[PDB]
Structure 1
Amino acid sequence: NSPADNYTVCEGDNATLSCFIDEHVTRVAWLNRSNILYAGNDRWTSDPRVRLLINTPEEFSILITEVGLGDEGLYTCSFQTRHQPYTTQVYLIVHVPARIVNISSPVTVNEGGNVNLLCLAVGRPEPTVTWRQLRDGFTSEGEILEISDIQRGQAGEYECVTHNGVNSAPDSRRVLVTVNYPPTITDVTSARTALGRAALLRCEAMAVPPADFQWYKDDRLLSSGTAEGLKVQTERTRSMLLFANVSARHYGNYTCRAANRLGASSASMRLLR
């Protein structure tokens, strides 16, 4: 519709501009913006990257070596007949493959907080930034990603990807989000076992960072020592209080305590006969 054609070349390539004319053309020239590059066989530009290829009375073509972002502009071919002037214009568009230049660091938040993740990429044409959740399929077309009231199931790796539609690869990058929540005791077991048989107590409280589980026998606490014949095994989500054989002093009330940086909890279980 408009005589402004788009001629996109990859950065660093060579751009050749061909101007096709009939026989009755008196003058002809290629112009960068409003500055002449070549007027027939006369070189006007001081840039050695511009070379003259064809000056046949049927076509006038020049070459640009090592095309750069600064070379982007409207290139016109003005030529003259005996009666009227002519211009055929071309718009040089430089393409740069997309690449992420800034992305958020691995963030930690407390459960229910608010998280904002940014993924900044540069590229020409303007690159499309996309956020993705690696554990559960989710996509948001935006440079920034905000998570409100983030929960346990939303923590994980958040991949960012950007592409400018070029043949080159999208150069995606990933960021890990780890939410923190205080321990909540989910499961508690008490044992009513006879003398001579083994028994065990346990508590189940999941927390991030993992809760330091504490055991209490009546007032005192257990140290997992061979004295009194007791041994506690602590895990990431549990802590089993193990009783090998029996003992008269072992019978009584017990309490476990699971605590991390965000809170603490305690539950009471007994050991009976």
Structure 2
Amino acid sequence: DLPKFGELLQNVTVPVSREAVLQCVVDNLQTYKIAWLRVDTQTILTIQNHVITKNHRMSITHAEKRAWILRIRDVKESDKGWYMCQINTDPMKSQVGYLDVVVPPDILDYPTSTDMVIREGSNVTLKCAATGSPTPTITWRREGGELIPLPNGAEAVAYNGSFLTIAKVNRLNMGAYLCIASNGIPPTVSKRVMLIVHFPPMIWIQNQLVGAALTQNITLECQSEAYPKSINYWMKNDTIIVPGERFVPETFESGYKITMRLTIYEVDIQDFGAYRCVAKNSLGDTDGAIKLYHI
């Protein structure tokens, strides 16, 4: 007929800065004495109604005869851990329960990756570190939902992991990636990471053969892809072409794409010949020929 525990030491979950309330139930306590304490540090908390700890945030109440209640006001994440309830029987009895302190997640600036600049076809690793309770799972996405090249040769719209490694980066992989940290404790937070892919230029021409008649206005057009952005100009007889009141070159730039036109006004017999659109950037140059002929 020694004291017995009326039930388990109930697990308790509580968000940071609130009041934790652990409760220990003892039947037939008689003249015996109940004691609380923190397990990890082996810190005596309370004995009967006295608080042994000088931690002003802890209190003990014994309203109902069978329930001894430990109260931790303004909980910190450092209070998370195992707590014990002890009865000074012989041999002594003890049961333990866990106090889980949940914290909304946060993404650390370090070692989380800053903007990345990678040559096309080379490796890159995006890192991201977050802190929370429970520990947050990290999810990678791209703006617009683009696919992420996965380590296993496949691709998907999301990847779990603190570090995302991409082998052989492609210009299509370029854009804004998102490090999304979540742990069930709102609010979920995220951080944007730019992946920049540099590559030399390439040119496509819809019509490498165009004709016209005198006094006519015709327009030649090329398309290029190059990053960083390329300088695009036109050539003829190996000579640059300047806006000359008759020729007007344009460029329509969008990301790593460029559409370059050369509008010629009032065609003259001297204009016919071999033109060239050219694109050049840090990583190389390229060109493409267009022939303009007479009707």
Smaller-chain TM-score range? 0.7 to 0.9
| Partner residue in 2 for 1:225 | 244
| Partner residue in 1 for 2:193 | 175
Give how far 1:55 is off: 5.3
1:121 aligns with 2:130: yes
Match of 2:232 among 210, 213, 226: 213
Stretches of structure 1 lacking an aligned partner (at least 5 in a row): none
> Alignment identity in percent?
30
For the residue of structure 2 that corresponds to 1:113, the secondary structure is coil
For the residue of structure 2 that corresponds to 1:235, the secondary structure is strand
| Partner residue in 1 for 2:15 | 10
Task: Please give the TM-score of this superposition, normalised by the length of structure 1.
Answer: 0.87
1:252 aligns with 2:260: no
Letter in 2 for 1:170: T
- CA deviations 1:52-110 (Å, max 9, x no partner) are 222554222221111123323332222246x7643232222322221211332222222
1:30 aligns with 2:36: yes
Q: Do the aligned residues in 1 keep the contact of 2:20 with 2:73 (CA within 8 Å)? A: yes
1:48-197 maps to which residues of 2 (within 5 A)? 48-54=56-62, 56-80=64-88, 85-102=92-109, 103-133=112-142, 134-136=145-147, 137-166=156-185, 168-187=186-205, 188-197=207-216
Q: Do the aligned residues in 1 keep the contact of 2:176 with 2:193 (CA within 8 Å)? A: yes
- CA deviations 1:120-178 (Å, max 9, x no partner) are 11122222112123323522221100111111222222111122233x12212222223
How many residues matched?
A: 267
Give how far 1:243 is off: 1.4
Q: Do the aligned residues in 2 keep the contact of 1:203 with 1:240 (CA within 8 Å)? A: yes
Letter in 2 for 1:139: A
1:234 aligns with 2:251: yes
Give how far 1:116 is off: 0.8
Give how far 1:210 is off: 2.7
Letter in 2 for 1:115: V
Letter in 2 for 1:67: V
Q: Do the aligned residues in 2 keep the contact of 1:118 with 1:143 (CA within 8 Å)? A: yes
Stretches of structure 2 lacking an aligned partner (at least 5 in a row): 1-7, 148-155
Structure 1's 87 and 66: CA in aligned 2 closer, same or farther, altered over 3 A?
A: same
For the residue of structure 2 that corresponds to 1:21, the secondary structure is strand
Q: After TM superposition, what 4+ stretches of structure 1 lie above 3 angstroms from structure 2?
A: 3-6
For the residue of structure 1 that corresponds to 2:225, the secondary structure is strand
Q: CA RMSD in A?
A: 2.3
For the residue of structure 1 that corresponds to 2:189, the secondary structure is coil
Task: Please give the TM-score of this superposition, normalised by the length of structure 2.
Answer: 0.81
Q: Do the aligned residues in 1 keep the contact of 2:16 with 2:77 (CA within 8 Å)? A: yes
